[PDB]
C-alpha cells in the first residue's frame with residue numbers, strides 16, 4: 001500500500017545507502033542483445049534477491065539502481081519490454097527487502113559514447129519529447145510500487161564538450177533546468193502514486209560549485225514537499241592518490257560542501273547520491289589496496305555519513321564496499337569501511 005510521505009521523511013529514512021553501480025548502467029555492447037549481456041558487460045554478476053536482503057540485513061536502508069537506457073530504446077523511444085521487466089525485477093528485489101530504492105537515467109548523460117541528454121539548448125530541443133516519452137514509460141511501468149521507490153530524472157548532465165565543473169555557455173543551465181521540469185511533468189502526468197511520489201533532480205554534473213548551485217532552478221511541482229536535489233562528491237578530487245590520511249584538509253573540504261548545500265537548499269532536502277575514493281582515471285580502493293589506503297577509504301566514509309546525518313541528508317556509496325564476486329556470496333568487499341560507516345551513523 002502506498003503511504004505518501006514528505007521528501008524529507010524519505011531522506012531521513014534512507015540511512016546508509018549503496019549504489020549498485022556498473023550493473024544496469026553498463027553499456028556499449030550495442031542494441032538487441034540479451035538482457036544479461038548488458039548487466040554483466042562491465043564485470044558485475046547478475047543481480048539477485050539475496051543481494052538486496054543482504055543490504056537490509058547488514059545495516060543499509062536504501063539502494064540506488066543506476067540504469068542506462070539508450071541501447072534498450074528503438075528509434076521511436078520505446079523501451080524493450082524485456083529490459084523494462086528486468087529493471088522492474090531488480091526494483092522488486094529492493095522493495096521485498098524493505099529498502100528504499102532509486103531508479104534513474106544514467107549513462108544517457110555525461111561523457112560516454114551514446115549519451116544523448118546534454119546541457120545544451122539545441123540538444124534539449126531535439127530530445128525533450130524522447131526524454132518525456134522515456135519517463136512516461138518508466139513512470140507507468142513502476143507506477144504501482146509504494147513510497148519506498150523514488151525516481152531520479154538524470155545522472156550527470158554535461159554540456160556538449162563534457163565540461164565537468166560548469167557548462168562553457170551559461171545557456172547550458174536552461175537546458176538542464178528545462179529537462180528537470182519535463183521529468184517532473186512527465187512523471188506527475190501519469191497520476192496514481194506518481195502524483196505524489198518523491199522525485200530527485202540533479203545539479204549540472206551533479207556538482208556543487210557556486211555557479212552550478214546559483215543557476216540551478218528547482219522544478220515547479222503541483223504538490224508540495226515531494227522533490228529532493230542530488231549532488232555527488234568525490235572531494236577533494238583525487239585524494240585517494242594524493243593523501244596518506246583523511247586529514248584536516250579533507251574534513252574541512254566536506255564540511256564546507258555540506259555548509260554550502262544546507263545554505264542553498266533551505267526548502268528541500270538534498271542527498272549525496274554518490275561518493276567514494278574514485279579519482280583520476282577512476283582509480284579507486286580495492287580489498288587488495290594497502291591497509292593504509294583502506295583506512296583512508298574507511299575514514300572518508302565515516303565522515304561523509306556523519307556529516308550527512310547532521311545535515312538531515314543521506315549518502316550512497318559508489319560500488320567499492322560490495323563488489324564483483326563478493327555480491328554473489330553475499331559478503332562485503334570492504335568490511336572495515338562498512339563498519340566505519342555503521343558506527344558513524346549510530
Ligand SMILES: [Cl-]
Pocket residue numbers: 027028112113114
Ligand atoms: Cl562506449
Ligand SMILES: [Cl-]
Pocket residue numbers: none
Ligand atoms: Cl563517475
